[PDB]
Scaffold this active site. Sequence first.
Site, short mmCIF file in Angstrom:
data_model
loop_
_atom_site.label_atom_id
_atom_site.label_comp_id
_atom_site.label_asym_id
_atom_site.label_seq_id
_atom_site.Cartn_x
_atom_site.Cartn_y
_atom_site.Cartn_z
N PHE A 1 15.42 -27.99 -25.16
CA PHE A 1 15.98 -28.32 -26.66
C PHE A 1 15.14 -27.26 -27.57
CE2 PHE A 1 18.46 -31.70 -24.99
CZ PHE A 1 17.55 -32.47 -23.99
N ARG B 1 15.82 -20.75 -41.84
CA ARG B 1 17.14 -21.10 -41.44
C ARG B 1 17.36 -22.35 -42.29
NH1 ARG B 1 21.38 -20.86 -37.55
NH2 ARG B 1 20.75 -18.90 -36.63
N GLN C 1 13.09 -21.19 -21.27
CA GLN C 1 14.30 -20.70 -22.04
C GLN C 1 14.25 -19.35 -22.23
OE1 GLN C 1 14.18 -24.48 -25.05
NE2 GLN C 1 15.96 -23.09 -25.32
N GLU D 1 24.25 -26.35 -30.87
CA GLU D 1 23.43 -27.20 -32.02
C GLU D 1 24.02 -27.86 -33.14
OE1 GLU D 1 21.19 -23.43 -32.82
OE2 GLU D 1 19.11 -24.21 -32.46
N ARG E 1 16.33 -27.74 -31.04
CA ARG E 1 17.90 -27.94 -31.57
C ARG E 1 17.93 -28.05 -32.98
NH1 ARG E 1 21.34 -31.94 -27.65
NH2 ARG E 1 23.47 -30.92 -27.71
N1 LIG Z 1 21.39 -30.89 -21.66
C1 LIG Z 1 20.98 -29.96 -22.74
N2 LIG Z 1 21.57 -29.69 -23.55
C2 LIG Z 1 21.21 -28.68 -24.87
C3 LIG Z 1 19.73 -28.46 -24.58
C4 LIG Z 1 18.97 -28.80 -23.54
O1 LIG Z 1 17.78 -28.69 -23.48
N3 LIG Z 1 19.46 -29.85 -22.57
N4 LIG Z 1 19.28 -27.44 -25.53
C5 LIG Z 1 20.07 -26.89 -26.66
C6 LIG Z 1 19.55 -26.17 -27.50
S1 LIG Z 1 17.93 -26.22 -28.16
C7 LIG Z 1 20.38 -25.09 -27.67
S2 LIG Z 1 19.76 -23.86 -28.56
C8 LIG Z 1 21.73 -25.10 -27.13
C9 LIG Z 1 22.20 -23.70 -26.81
O2 LIG Z 1 22.48 -23.60 -25.53
P1 LIG Z 1 23.74 -22.50 -25.42
O3 LIG Z 1 23.36 -21.28 -26.18
O4 LIG Z 1 23.94 -21.85 -23.84
O5 LIG Z 1 24.72 -23.22 -26.19
O6 LIG Z 1 22.32 -26.13 -26.50
C10 LIG Z 1 21.43 -27.51 -26.52
N5 LIG Z 1 22.13 -28.18 -25.51
O1 LIG Z 2 14.17 -15.18 -33.97
C1 LIG Z 2 14.76 -16.28 -33.98
N1 LIG Z 2 15.82 -16.33 -34.61
C2 LIG Z 2 16.93 -17.56 -34.67
O2 LIG Z 2 17.85 -17.55 -35.51
C3 LIG Z 2 16.66 -18.50 -33.74
N2 LIG Z 2 17.09 -19.57 -33.38
C4 LIG Z 2 16.49 -19.89 -32.16
N3 LIG Z 2 15.28 -19.16 -31.88
C5 LIG Z 2 15.42 -18.08 -32.97
N4 LIG Z 2 14.52 -17.05 -32.99
O1 MOM Z 3 16.40 -24.98 -30.34
MO1 MOM Z 3 17.61 -24.33 -29.46
O2 MOM Z 3 17.65 -22.74 -30.94
O3 MOM Z 3 16.43 -23.40 -28.40
#
Ligand SMILES: Nc1nc2c(c(=O)[nH]1)N[C@H]1C(S)=C(S)[C@@H](COP(=O)(O)O)O[C@H]1N2
Ligand SMILES: O=c1[nH]c(=O)c2nc[nH]c2[nH]1
Ligand code: MOM
EC number: 1.1.1.204
Lengths: 760, 450
Positions: free
Chosen positions: A227, A309, A196, A713, A341
């Site tokens: 995630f 957070r 990521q 999230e 997440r």
């Molecule tokens: N299918 C799927 N959806 C997911 C995830 C993933 O690993 N797989 N991760 C998530 C997490 S941890 C985050 S932070 C987000 C954000 O992605 P975006 O910033 O593109 O919305 O969606 C969630 N949706």
């Molecule tokens: O520095 C950070 N601040 C955040 O709020 C956050 N959320 C996911 N990953 C993060 N890293």
């Molecule tokens: O857990 Mo999503 O902040 O990567």
Amino acid sequence: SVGKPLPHDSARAHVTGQARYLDDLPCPANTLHLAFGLSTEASAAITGLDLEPVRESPGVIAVFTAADLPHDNDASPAPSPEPVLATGEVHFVGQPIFLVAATSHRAARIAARKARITYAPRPAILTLDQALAADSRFEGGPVIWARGDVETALAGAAHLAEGCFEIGGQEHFYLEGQAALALPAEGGVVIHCSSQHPSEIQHKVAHALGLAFHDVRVEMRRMGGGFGGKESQGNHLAIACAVAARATGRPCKMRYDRDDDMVITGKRHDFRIRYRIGADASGKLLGADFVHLARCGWSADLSLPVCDRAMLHADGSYFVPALRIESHRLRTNTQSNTAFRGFGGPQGALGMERAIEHLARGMGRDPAELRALNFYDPPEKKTQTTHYGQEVADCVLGELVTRLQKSANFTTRRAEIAAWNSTNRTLARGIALSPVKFGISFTLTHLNQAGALVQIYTDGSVALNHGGTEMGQGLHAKMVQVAAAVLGIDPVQVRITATDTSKVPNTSATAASSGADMNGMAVKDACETLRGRLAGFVAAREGCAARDVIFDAGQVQASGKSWRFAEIVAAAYMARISLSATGFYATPKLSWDRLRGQGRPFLYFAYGAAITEVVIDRLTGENRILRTDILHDAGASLNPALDIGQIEGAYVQGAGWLTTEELVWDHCGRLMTHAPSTYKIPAFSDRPRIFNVALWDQPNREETIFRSKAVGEPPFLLGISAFLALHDACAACGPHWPDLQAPATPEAVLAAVRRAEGRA
Amino acid sequence: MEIAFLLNGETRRVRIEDPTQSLLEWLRAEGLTGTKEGCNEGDCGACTVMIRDAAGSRAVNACLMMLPQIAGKALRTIEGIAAPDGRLHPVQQAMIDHHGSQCGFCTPGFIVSMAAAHDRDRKDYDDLLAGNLCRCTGYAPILRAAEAAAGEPPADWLQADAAFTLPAFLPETSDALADWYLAHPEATLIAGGTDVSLWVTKALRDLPEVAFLSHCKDLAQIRETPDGYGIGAGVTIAALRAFAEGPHPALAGLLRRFASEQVRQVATIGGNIANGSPIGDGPPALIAMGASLTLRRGQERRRMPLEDFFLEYRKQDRRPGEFVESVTLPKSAPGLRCYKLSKRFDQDISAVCGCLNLTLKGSKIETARIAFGGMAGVPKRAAAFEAALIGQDFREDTIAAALPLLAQDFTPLSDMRASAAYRMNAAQAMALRYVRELSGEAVAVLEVMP
Ligand SMILES: Nc1nc2c(c(=O)[nH]1)N[C@H]1C(S)=C(S)[C@@H](COP(=O)(O)O)O[C@H]1N2
Ligand SMILES: O=c1[nH]c(=O)c2nc[nH]c2[nH]1
Ligand code: MOM
Ligand SMILES: Cc1cc2nc3c(=O)[nH]c(=O)nc-3n(C[C@H](O)[C@H](O)[C@H](O)COP(=O)(O)OP(=O)(O)OC[C@H]3O[C@@H](n4cnc5c(N)ncnc54)[C@H](O)[C@@H]3O)c2cc1C
Ligand code: FES
Ligand code: FES
Ligand SMILES: [Ca+2]
């Protein structure tokens, strides 16, 4: 194309098994394979490291030690060192000590197991209390934020609920395990990985190797899930590959085998939350006092922001005139916990949701009503602020909950359940409604930037590229839809390319549900630049104003004449007009003091509510969700299909966290839940038997990408709804406070039932 | 040694040299990259492949299966699910239509499971897909997909494979086996491989002397006997569930929650029983129903009651050269009930397995077969509880009084699956359950209607 329920960019690729992941990519026959040798103590010095049987295991080309590390030995996403290979001592069970490169992934795992290690064990911090006891903590002392004066408020409170309870960890279980591949490329290296955060990979691999950043390139097309799990834990693999490639001369791959994955990688911070909450006799909250004990594991990782957070989310959905949080981020000799997440969000939220449930029960009031009484005011003298002092001006929660309650048939059903319970003595049903208020943006502010790069080719086709990484969330399609929408052409004309540090640089991780928000802006910015060029060219050829040139439905129109988008592009090609553009976005209005706990760290909030219905077996604790009803605010959703998808997926993962999902260490610090047979994520027939999801559809007040809202999230916290409902089933088995702990396994439900009945 | 089999509509002759290579390792080494690796432990379904032969077709896990096991079979993988001409299976189109995927990583395995289900017109999705973990979607979109696609007619290109046929010992007759095991008492006998292959994937062991049992038809038969029903060692759990659905519904009710459909398809009773595992849900139930077991050692044919087979944890009444030949069940219960307690209902293991079976002469408790798994290093009947229950009235308090005895019967363990307190507690909870079920009471969460 924004607004349309268009499918995932790779839907067909998935369904055919042609979508490649890291372990699928072709690569040269000489590629080596990497496995870590892991620590078997939780807190020891190493006095003896005999690796001779490792070097001699078949197929093994190289064996590596901290001493063998060319340069840096640090995979931490934070300013404090975390070695990739153990530096004279170990800090949890599973800690890599040495690295094997061998001619196959089997051979490598096999030899990793053959080390003769001697340790001199030491006392180990494994429980949060031992942690307070020993002062094993990060930051030197707890973080403390107060708004008003709780103690005073609580002292005069008509009603008070004092309490304490456990929230357990959570392992990601991304179906695609951690993985990376390093290709030596004269002078520099190329990294492919399941990450990521490619830019952090670049940073880390560079330092590992002694190279300037411009010599390290990170390409990444898609992850089979992340995630948060792949927000930083990809670092050890990428370093391992790079270092080993530099030495061996040959390409190097490393994918964690599942067991290794759960033993090595961090999980979600488990919390103990202790609370005191008070209300006047009308039911308005007077004050809430929280203490947070969070398990961070052995190194800092992203624990600091995670915990920040939780604090930020301790208000739940509710206005509170006096509130205080004391946040202990305690060090333990266990897996260095990381992002997942929600990022601390659901923990703080649940702490508060438990407190308000307590108060409600304790004054024998309907909990739903009590929450509804304490939502932040609707939008429209001086606005209510949060405890950190951010004005809450987008709170639609009151109405959403009303809408959800009628459409879910809430009142009636509750009576239906009471009646049912009254006729039953072995089984029992509970039902709960819980709200969501999630703040959008990296709390580390300068991370709130995103870039895009767009090319238009002479045949009218478009190559799209941004900093966001695709892990299943449908980011890429939304990015496609934006660009298509801005250029005034069909999605089909827009191709998405792999994320690549050499195309868009200096990118944040794809996290804090900010991906589509900021990259959406970045993509639209390059797109408008490109459109501006074509308009200005057409206008001058056709005589008139650029704002009068129309791009729509794959046609361009100026001066009563119309062309295909292509014809225009070939024309600007011939006229020597650049058909390439970068795009960039930084989120506005953000400013806050981490330490003083004051400011505006968020651009806006994402809201929702769920109503879970469940049943429990009063003898064993066994249980099922029977029905769920979600109303959730995606703003003006960029993709309603993709959004319903995220919500359905997020809910099941949230509910899963508070039910069958349980992390378990032994007394020596060994993870006992380290495989699919022992760690239990929602199986198929765990889906709510009736699953109703509907989008609150209302544009965002703030100027986000086509007035949408992050849905990444926020919908994960709707899983609280389930835990609350489960506790509601218990509270119908007796007059006592059930005091249900999380996760609510059958065992934990049985215990909470027995309390409520009042027996041992 | 050289096997042959159909691979995605095309005959392939592999020349075997390591008999222990998973179907997983082999397919991806071939570049059949669409079969994914999610755990290598039978749990996730990411490697779900389709096999066909005279019996028909079923979805199994490519990671549990070892090459010799597919000799003479037809095998379909994800890359072979769509039509030769390029057309998508109703299953594949549906999944797109219904957004049945997100990150995709689990999509090949569902599709394979969904196609094989489509191929056999099976619609019991909860069960068919329980072995398929998806962390992304919440499974709902997948259920629509399945329903959506069920209207469509079966893929003929898939059906075509039926035409087909029509180092490591591979016997075809029970005799052939007996003689060989008689000479090599120190060899490893692979049936379905569902326990054995985890010693290679996870334990990283090499199995030197190996003989496969799944190509030996006479050993895997359900026959009727004068005294009841004779089940051969090679009968799959899936089959045994199928057979019980008539005669022994309660066992079929328990076998439903045995692993997944993909393990059930290939895992056997002989294996479950020869594994000899305190948390194995076969013996508990079968002992409760008082089944016999048969052993064989070449020509030998000892015939004890099942319970007596299990002497101590890791130790059974098994001679060198002697293999589980079969079990025999009575023509009928129906005083049998079975209780599997786990953290999650589908594909999990038992903290406690409560299998109870009492006969009542009108009102007095006459017979007491109460058996357990997971309470002890061996599956065993609740002796003192059983005793303390004979002659008595069949009522709540009767048993309410007898309960403590179990604490003398067993001293259960504590580990990640459950706390000893709870393992005990739930063991007693099952008896209060039994009475309540046997008297018309609402008792089971799983039967509750949304
Ligand atoms: N299918 C799927 N959806 C997911 C995830 C993933 O690993 N797989 N991760 C998530 C997490 S941890 C985050 S932070 C987000 C954000 O992605 P975006 O910033 O593109 O919305 O969606 C969630 N949706
Ligand atoms: O520095 C950070 N601040 C955040 O709020 C956050 N959320 C996911 N990953 C993060 N890293
Ligand atoms: O857990 Mo999503 O902040 O990567
Ligand atoms: C995902 C997963 C879920 C599972 N869930 C369950 C569950 O719910 N309940 C449960 O009880 N088990 C479960 N298991 C394990 C279970 O033991 C096997 O799946 C099955 O019962 C054994 O069948 P098999 O033929 O594969 O045995 P194998 O793996 O082939 O055999 C195991 C042992 O028995 C020997 N053996 C096999 N057959 C004979 C014979 N006829 N005579 C002498 N020796 C023999 C083998 O040599 C080996 O020593 C699960 C396994 C997995 C991977
Ligand atoms: S890999 Fe998970 S089942 Fe074979
Ligand atoms: S979509 Fe990611 S696991 Fe099924
Ligand atoms: Ca992890």
